[PDB]
Design brief:
27% strand; homodimer; 8-stranded mixed sheet; Rossmann fold; 326 residues; globular; biosynthetic protein; CmnB; alpha/beta
Chain lengths: 326, 327
C-alpha cells in the first residue's frame, strides 16, 4: 500500500488555527542555530511563457533534526510574473513530508498559504523578542494576502494592537483591507503610514528602495519582509539589524542587504535564532530603528507542515490518497 | 480554482499500455541534443534512518519543447536501502506537470512505476541503436522492480528475446523473478555466470563498489549500466564504444565511476545516444569487444513521458480531479 495524507488550503488553515505556529518557528530557529537543520541547494527551473513573462519552479528540500525527532520534506513553489494580470496569485504550489524510515512521501499539502503563514509567524517571533514592548499599532506597506495573514496573527499574538495604518500603491487594495479587533487607517502616502506607528511590515513587490531613516520614530521596528523597500542608510544607521540566516542573505545580492554585504562590512547584530538560543543579546528599539531582514527559510515551512500534519492526524482531518489504486 | 489531475500507479500503467514509451524517450533525446530542453541540477536530501540505513529524496526538474509544445515538471523520487528487508519497493514518489502559462502544478502522478518505465525505455532505445541485432538472450544483475519493467519492455520491443539469465545477491528474489509470459528465466548462482550466459547485460543493483571486470564479457557484448557503479574502470578503458545520455551531467557527479574517471584524465567516450539519434555521432554495435551505455538519468525523459501519459489519461477519461484549495 502507498498512501498520501492530502491537506488542501482550507485544511492547512484549520490546522494552523489549532496549533502554535510562532512556537514551531522559534523551535526550528533554535534547531537551525544549533546546526540541526539541512537546507540543500534548491532545484530551479526558469522559463518564459507565450506572453514573454518570467516563470519558474523552485524545489526546496529541507530537514529539521528538531525538538521532537527528525523531519524531512520539500516545498515546491512556482510563479508566473503574468499571473496577477489574469486574476491569479503570482505563486502556487505544494509541500510534502517524507517518512523518516522508508523516505516515502506520506503528506502532500497546498503550500502557498503555509508560505505566507510561515513569513507572518517569523514576523510575530521577531516582534516578541526584538519589537517595542506593548505596541498598540502596526503599519503595513502593501495590503494583500500577506497583510491579511499578518493581521490574523496580530489578533492571536499581539491583542494590544487595535489600529492598522496602511498604504498601498494600488489604492483600491488599501481601501478593501479590513484586517482581523483592528481599525484600519488608509494613508495617502507610504511616509504617513510609517510615521503613524512604531512597527512597520513592508509587503510590497518593489525593486527601488524608497524608505529613508528619517521616517522612523525613535524606538521603532521594521520587519523588512519584502526585502527592497529600505534605503541603504537605514541598515547603516540601524540601532540593531537582525537576520534569519546571514549566509542566505549574502548569497542573494539582488536584494539590498545582500548588495551592501558585497560592498563591505554592514552592522549585522545577529540572527533571531542567536537571540532565541542566548548566543546574542536581544536589542529592542529605544533611540532608533531595529531592522529585521529575513530572507525566508524553507526549513520553517517543513517544521510547520510537520506540526500541521500531526494536528491533522490527531483531529482526523484531510483525505487519504491511494497512490496505487489496485 | 487550483485543480490537479491525479494519476495513481494502475492509471499510469493503463496509460503506458496505449503509448510508445521508447518513441517518447527517443523524441526527448533528439530535443535534448538540439538544446530544446532545460535540465537543472537535481535537488538532493540524504539522511540516515533509525535503522542506520541510507535514505534520500531527489527532486529532478526538467523542461522539453517537443511534440506537445513546451512541457515543464518534476519527479520527486525517494529511496531507503532498508525498504526491501521490510517488504516495500526500495523507491517511491510523485511527479508533477506545470502549466506553461501560470506555472501551477496541474498533474500529480505516482512516479515510482513511471521512473522504472523511463529507465527501461532508455535501455530499449540504446539496444535498438547500439545493441547486437537479433539477440535472443538478456542477463540481469538484480531482479527487483527495475528488472520486472525491463522484462515488460523486452516483450514489446525485442520479442526475439526468449531467455533471461538472472543473478541476485538474494537468491529468493531471483527465484521469484518470472519476466513476461514469453520469457524463460534461468537463475545463475554468481554475477559472473549471469554475465557470461549472454551478450546483453543490464546492471540493476544498489552497490557502491565496482566488481565487473572486462574479462567477464563475451566478444560482441553490450551493457546497459543502469546501476552506474558495477563496472570496473578497465571496462570503460577497453570498451569497443562508450555512450552516455549527457557527458557534462556525468562529469558533474564524480561519486559514480565514469564521472571519477573523467576527473582523472581521458576516457574513450564515443558520444551520446541523443547524438546517435540526430546523426551527430555514428552508432557502434558490438563486434569484437563490449559496448557500454552509461546513462546518469535525465528528468527531461520523465517530464516527456508524464506529458504523454497525462494526454492519454485525458483522452481515455482516466484519473481524478483534486482541489488544492477546498471549500
Amino acid at each position: 500500500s502507498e498512501e498520501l495524507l492530502f491537506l488542501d488550503r482550507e485544511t492547512v488553515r484549520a490546522c494552523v488555527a489549532g496549533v502554535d505556529p510562532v512556537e514551531v518557528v522559534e523551535s526550528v530557529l533554535r534547531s537551525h542555530a544549533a546546526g540541526r537543520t539541512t537546507l540543500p541547494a534548491e532545484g530551479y527551473l526558469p522559463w518564459e511563457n507565450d506572453q514573454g513573462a518570467y516563470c519558474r519552479s523552485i524545489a526546496m528540500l529541507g530537514a529539521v533534526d528538531g525538538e521532537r525527532g527528525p523531519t524531512y520534506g520539500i516545498k515546491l513553489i512556482n510563479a508566473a510574473v503574468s499571473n496577477p494580470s489574469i486574476g491569479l496569485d503570482r505563486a502556487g504550489g505544494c509541500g510534502f513530508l517524507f517518512d523518516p524510515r522508508t523516505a516515502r512521501p506520506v503528506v502532500l499539502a497546498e503550500a502557498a498559504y503555509l508560505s505566507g503563514l510561515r513569513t507572518a509567524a517569523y514576523t510575530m517571533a521577531s516582534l516578541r523578542h526584538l519589537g517595542p514592548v506593548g505596541f498598540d499599532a502596526v503599519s503595513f506597506i502593501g495590503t494583500g494576502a500577506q497583510a491579511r495573514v499578518h493581521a490574523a496573527l496580530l489578533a492571536r499574538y499581539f491583542p494590544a494592537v487595535r489600529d492598522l495604518h496602511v498604504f498601498d500603491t494600488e489604492r483600491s487594495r488599501a481601501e478593501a483591507f479590513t484586517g482581523a479587533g483592528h481599525t484600519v487607517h488608509v494613508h495617502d502616502t507610504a511616509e504617513a503610514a510609517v510615521r503613524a506607528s512604531h512597527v512597520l511590515v513592508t509587503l510590497t513587490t518593489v525593486d527601488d528602495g524608497y524608505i529613508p531613516h528619517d521616517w522612523f520614530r525613535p524606538g521603532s521596528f521594521v520587519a523588512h519582509v519584502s526585502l527592497d523597500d529600505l534605503l541603504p542608510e537605514v541598515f547603516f544607521k540601524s540601532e540593531a539589524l537582525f537576520v534569519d540566516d546571514l549566509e542566505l542573505i549574502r548569497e542573494n545580492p539582488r536584494r539590498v542587504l545582500g548588495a551592501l554585504l558585497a560592498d563591505g562590512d554592514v552592522p549585522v547584530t545577529g540572527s533571531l535564532g542567536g537571540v532565541l538560543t542566548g548566543a546574542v543579546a536581544p536589542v529592542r528599539p529605544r533611540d532608533g530603528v531595529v531592522v529585521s531582514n529575513p530572507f525566508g527559510m524553507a526549513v520553517l515551512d517543513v517544521g510547520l507542515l510537520a506540526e500541521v500534519a500531526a494536528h491533522a492526524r490527531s483531529a482526523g482531518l484531510g483525505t487519504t490518497l491511494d497512490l496505487l489504486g489496485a
